[PDB]
Amino acid sequence: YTDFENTFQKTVEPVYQMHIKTSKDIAVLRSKEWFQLDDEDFDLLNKTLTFETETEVTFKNANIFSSVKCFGPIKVELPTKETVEIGIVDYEAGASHGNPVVDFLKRNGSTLEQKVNLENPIPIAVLDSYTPSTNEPYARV
Amino acid sequence: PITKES
């Protein structure tokens, strides 16, 4: 298939956390045109930020995107550990080779993972099943 | 200017 004009891809990106320690990290974040606070004078210092971003992408060919979008809320951890919306990501390119927003957060921040592995797996069972002789009864229902 | 006393 070469009909790239009809392809597209929505992705929900994994939640990313950034600990803002220094006025350097604030200055890098204020550099990024896509980092958009609701109130520009918000004190980001010592705050923990989460980025919940969806990426939409159209294609031009196998590897070059004809259009990128990376939008989503930016939340700040309160002292109760409850996250509250204080801004948005709002990246919007044309012909790109990558999502720079994700690449920024991959390096500077850390992936919040909902799934936590146990120390060792716990076997439950090893069970036999049979597939039926005919596929009509499943096809009927 | 800073060396000027009173």
Binding site: S23, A27, V28 | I2, T3
Partner: protein, 145 residues
């Protein structure tokens, strides 16, 4: 005598201040003791001199200081000031009574100099490491897109 205006003002210099302050007893001991005929004391309160073994670290802030109508010195300048003290007029003056020369370029008139120095260093190391970071991130963004 190479005296200092730093009398524990900057701190973290060991016993430098204790050494320099102590030299100032020679101005009184010249009158009191019995060596006035063999030695003359000519104290030279040397100011901020750029490029030396003791003050090479502190050169970047020197432009900052000079914008308070204060004077930092090159080594040739400070030498020239000190060679002024071996001219025949100041030599005839040291033999009458001890001579205290202030070559401090008005640096005593800056109030709370250690803070003002730390504030000048921090506004410069900051503006460096920020611009270094913003440039290396704007390169990594450009290269991904």
């Amino acid at each position: 005598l190479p005296m200092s205006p730093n009398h524990g003002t900057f701190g973290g210099d060991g016993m430098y201040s204790e050494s320099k302050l102590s030299l100032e007893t020679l101005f009184n001991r010249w009158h009191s003791e019995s060596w006035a005929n063999q030695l003359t004391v000519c104290g030279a309160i040397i100011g901020w001199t750029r490029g030396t073994g003791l003050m090479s670290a502190n050169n970047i802030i020197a432009e900052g200081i000079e914008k308070m109508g204060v004077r930092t010195f090159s080594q040739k300048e400070m030498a020239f000031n000190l060679l002024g003290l071996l001219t025949p007029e100041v030599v005839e003056l040291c033999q009458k009574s001890p001579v205290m020369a202030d070559l401090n370029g008005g640096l005593q008139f800056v109030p709370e100099l250690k803070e003002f120095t730390a504030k000048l260093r921090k506004e410069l190391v900051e503006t460096s490491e920020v611009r270094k970071a913003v440039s290396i991130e704007t390169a990594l963004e450009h290269k991904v897109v």
